[PDB]
Design a binder for these strands. Structure first.
Length: 42
RNA sequence: AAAAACAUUAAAAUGAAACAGGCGAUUGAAAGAGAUAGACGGGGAGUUUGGCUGG
């Protein structure tokens, strides 16, 4: 009955998934309104 | 640097860690473009290159 059990993954010479926000290229109006706040704080 | 190979649509009970007010670097208050001033500039523009006179 030992067929269904745990199976860990690889991710060596293989791929690995991860969330990639902070890299999204938001529209020009979002970028402008986000960097505007920074200029107020710098 | 032993091997011209495979690697994806997950099991299982999150797996696959969080946060930053920076996509990652480089240059930097200098340099580019503007204005004014000096230099240089036949690369180019405009023009000139007297008269008498045994032609």
């Amino acid at each position: 009955l030992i067929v269904a059990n745990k199976k860990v993954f690889g991710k060596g010479n293989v791929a690995h998934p991860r969330d990639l926000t902070r890299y999204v290229k938001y529209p020009l109006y979002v970028r402008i309104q986000k960097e505007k706040r920074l200029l107020m704080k710098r």
